[PDB]
Design a protein around this ligand. Structure first.
Ligand code: HEM
Ligand code: HEM
Ligand code: HEM
Ligand code: HEM
Lengths: 146, 141, 141, 146
């Protein structure tokens, strides 16, 4: 993904401060509340009926951890997102049957959560770089769909 | 909003289709699956090979719904209320896909009705399919 | 459709924005221009540089219009009528761009309202912005 | 863009039969009727108040043919869409200020028109191949946007 070193060091800069244990659950949780239709993939996660039931749902929190862990690993390989995510791409498509549009929604939500946690330090320039990142990640996860 | 000239255009157009609604329905589905493979994630249980029955059958169900919408054009939200219900609470298809199937319907119609598919008619049908989509996703949240 | 709960969330959040609106609006536009450069095609005459006086002044206008929709949340299509005509006949911005700016507004508000930006408020504000966008885009054709 | 050799072939075979004058004028005219906001870029072309005025406007027709000309050249370069359209991208961004989202619209209109002309011959597989071409072209035209 065409990313300047300016873009790259800033992205990496900020990520150092991220509590993956928290941001992952916030991001997955907000996805399920803001775009309620995406709940069609997580019925087995139990009760998701009110905002609190979703945000505090332990399976939602555990699962968001896994999501962000894999994301972190993508930030470690920004020059090979496609290869880094190929088996996850095959899985989401062949086993889980997830519409790739869903990766873009999560990307955008994640950006709002970032903003929420860092305030002023989430500058427009820093946002612009994170938008390129979530777009690259979303594209890499969709690439093996056929 | 559909104008009177739009409603006329869509009844006329849909009128010719006539008995061929079911087939054009199935054709649009096939074009969508091959043109936009991500749409297939919503149909993991169907055989999607060329000309197979599941697709045949669903093609008619889609067409009937539209025929229904054409005959109830001044009252779409009410005539489609249960379908909207079903899309919002059970199917939960991402809204972007509706444009993809809409386009494939337009292509299917252009292919079968060369004389009737004028630019004014093209315009009306597009607005109509967009209005239908709006209705089907109105209760998502 | 906005619900009673959404209207409440929206009024409370915009209430906390207050006299920072023109400023959040300008920040939203700046976020938009850097994250989605295609949007700059609609402002070829504006000096878009950070701190630009034209940009701050424009944020204010965007913000005031949002304030008027919050103030008339039960009569939005009519309170925004003049704005919807301007967009359809003069501005003619492509619908996809309204989502980009909405997203940037949400980011701007999350960046400034840590306590009010709960999952439920974010959900209502997102819905609200999608209805504003729909109104402003409703008379395009 | 990843085109199959038989897809590359399906596209070339059909293009060989396109009447560029007719198809070009028809695609552009339809873009202007189906998506009236696009008219913002062609104020100088004249009266465009109605579909008939638009479809009969000789400048629209002449411009339709020129656009499709540039498109034809792109089919001779399917392995290098970016390089072929680099300067056309600079132009459409720096001087004309055209939002690339408009390229996708013209692409889809272009596909309905070919369907309209070639009928039974514009089969689902043929359509699938032309959908990739049109996206590829749209993406190359968008490349130098900054
Ligand atoms: C940043 C993008 C995403 C990444 C990196 C990601 C990563 C992962 C990982 C690591 C797993 C566990 C894999 C396994 O069980 O073997 C997973 C599972 C799953 N993902 Fe995603 N995911 C993403 C987005 C999405 C979204 C948007 C959806 C649907 C809305 C989704 C639906 C699922 C489902 C349904 C599971 C299995 C749940 C279960 O265990 O029952 N993923 N994802
Ligand atoms: C023009 C818009 C559409 C209309 C009018 C329409 C109409 C219908 C109808 C009438 C049904 C059967 C409802 C029943 O169970 O009685 C149906 C089912 C379904 N539709 Fe559509 N549909 C539309 C668009 C879409 C799109 C865009 C998708 C996704 C790409 C989609 C995916 C589905 C799925 C997954 C089912 C359930 C099939 C099954 O499991 O048997 N639909 N639709
Ligand atoms: C939240 C949705 C939006 C609202 C409420 C809004 C509101 C406004 C207002 C009040 C004006 C001033 C017009 C006047 O009265 O003279 C304006 C102008 C304008 N807007 Fe927006 N706008 C929105 C979205 C957009 C977006 C998505 C675009 C394109 C990316 C856009 C581009 C423009 C342009 C080009 C002008 C005219 C600039 C000039 O003065 O030359 N707007 N808008
Ligand atoms: C398939 C994608 C497109 C291609 C290949 C294309 C190609 C061209 C070409 C060859 C020219 C002539 C440039 C010159 O030598 O002066 C041109 C001009 C232009 N294009 Fe495009 N075009 C495309 C899409 C669009 C669309 C979608 C729009 C806006 C809706 C647009 C707006 C314009 C404008 C405003 C001009 C200048 C017209 C004039 O001279 O008055 N183009 N384009």
């Amino acid at each position: 993904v065409h990313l300047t070193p300016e873009e790259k060091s800033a992205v990496t800069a900020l990520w150092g401060k991220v509590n993956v244990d928290e941001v992952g659950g916030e991001a997955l949780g907000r996805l399920l509340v803001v775009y309620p239709w995406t709940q069609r993939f997580f019925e087995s996660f139990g009760d998701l009926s009110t905002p609190d039931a979703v945000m505090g749902n332990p399976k939602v929190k555990a699962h968001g951890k896994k999501v962000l862990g894999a994301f972190s690993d993508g930030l470690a390989h920004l020059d090979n997102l496609k290869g880094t995510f190929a088996t996850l791409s095959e899985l989401h498509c062949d086993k889980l049957h997830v519409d790739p549009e869903n990766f873009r929604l999560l990307g955008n939500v994640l950006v709002c959560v970032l903003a929420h946690h860092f305030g002023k330090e989430f500058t427009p320039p820093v946002q612009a770089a994170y938008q390129k990142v979530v777009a690259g990640v979303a594209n890499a996860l969709a690439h093996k769909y056929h | 909003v559909l104008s009177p000239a739009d409603k006329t255009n869509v009844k006329a157009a849909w009128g010719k289709v006539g008995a061929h609604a079911g087939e054009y329905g199935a054709e649009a589905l096939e074009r969508m699956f091959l043109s936009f493979p991500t749409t297939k994630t919503y149909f993991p249980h169907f055989d999607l090979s060329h000309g197979s029955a599941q697709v045949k059958g669903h093609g008619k169900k889609v067409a009937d719904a539209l025929t229904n919408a054409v005959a109830h054009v001044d009252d779409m939200p009410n005539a489609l209320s249960a379908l909207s219900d079903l899309h919002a609470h059970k199917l939960r298809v991402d809204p972007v896909n509706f444009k993809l199937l809409s386009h494939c319907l337009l292509v299917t119609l252009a292919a079968h009705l060369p004389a009737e598919f004028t630019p004014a008619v093209h315009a009306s049908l597009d607005k109509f399919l967009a209005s239908v989509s709006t209705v089907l996703t109105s209760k998502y949240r």
